[PDB]
């Protein structure tokens, strides 16, 4: 829906992703989730207390819009975690790939993200501003984002 | 303040001010208010329901970065309805007229405001989807801006 889009603005930002991203402060953290992470639970116990959405999309296409928009806290440390597949750290899902090249764009430089363990993953996502859900259905389709600051 | 502001949108547009131009309708209206106008009653009866500000700046400050992101309804009828001088329909305030710079600006062509009286100002100020108040204390420094359309 390209209903109400603003002026160079990505317009699968929504009215109230938009407000999320813009009320953040520095190194505050966003979930980006897939279906079958518990967004509802989890977003229960974020800042917003609701889960948001940027719906049917794929994680990748939703990490594009969010950073089209937000800053992330690279400079000062690595701010794009993803989950870690089940007993290989270093193992790279299709889904997340995908993702770290919208990071890469983005940032316009190699900013590989750093592996998160499942447990310590939704203990994170208890504490982040958001949950973003999407239409992301593969498996460890989520990421945690900490925004930066612009100059 | 710059505090979370956003990749390549103005800052002076607070999260709930982005909220609302993002969830406005093609046709929908907000009014930009000064510090005379009763913003607070009129506010009330608005879809946002409360008042919300771009504070400290002047009326142009405010058009400035509500048409960095907003489309106006231009192609299809006048979209910025302005406040008439008692008595003067044709007359223009400096207020007024540093506002037209900047919807010139926005559009590239002459888009000259359109008069109102002061009585249907108010009754149109309370069918808005929002009032956006200002530090504009200058007289006359209220505006009505109609939502367009991207392609």
Redesign the interface.
């Known amino acids: 829906y390209?209903?109400?889009?603003?002026?160079?603005?990505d317009p699968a930002?929504?009215?109230?992703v938009?407000?999320?991203?813009?009320?953040?402060?520095?190194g505050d953290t966003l979930v980006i989730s897939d279906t079958n992470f518990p967004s509802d639970s989890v977003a229960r116990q974020t800042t917003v207390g609701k889960v948001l959405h940027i719906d049917n999309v794929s994680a990748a296409r939703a990490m594009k819009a969010i950073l089209?928009?937000?800053?992330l806290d690279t400079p000062l440390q690595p701010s794009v975690g993803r989950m870690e597949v089940m007993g290989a750290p270093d193992q790279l899902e299709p889904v997340q790939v995908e993702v770290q090249q919208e990071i890469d764009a983005a940032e316009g430089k190699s900013a590989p993200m750093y592996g998160i363990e499942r447990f310590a993953f939704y203990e994170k996502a208890k504490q982040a501003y958001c949950v973003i859900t999407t239409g992301e259905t593969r498996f460890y389709g989520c990421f945690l984002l900490t925004?930066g600051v612009?100059p």
């Not at 390209?2 to 603005?9: A, V, W």
């Not at 938009?18 to 520095?26: D, T």
Request: hydrophobic share 50%.
């Open positions: 390209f209903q109400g889009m603003l002026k160079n603005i930002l929504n009215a109230d938009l407000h999320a991203l813009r009320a953040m402060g520095h089209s928009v937000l800053p925004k612009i």
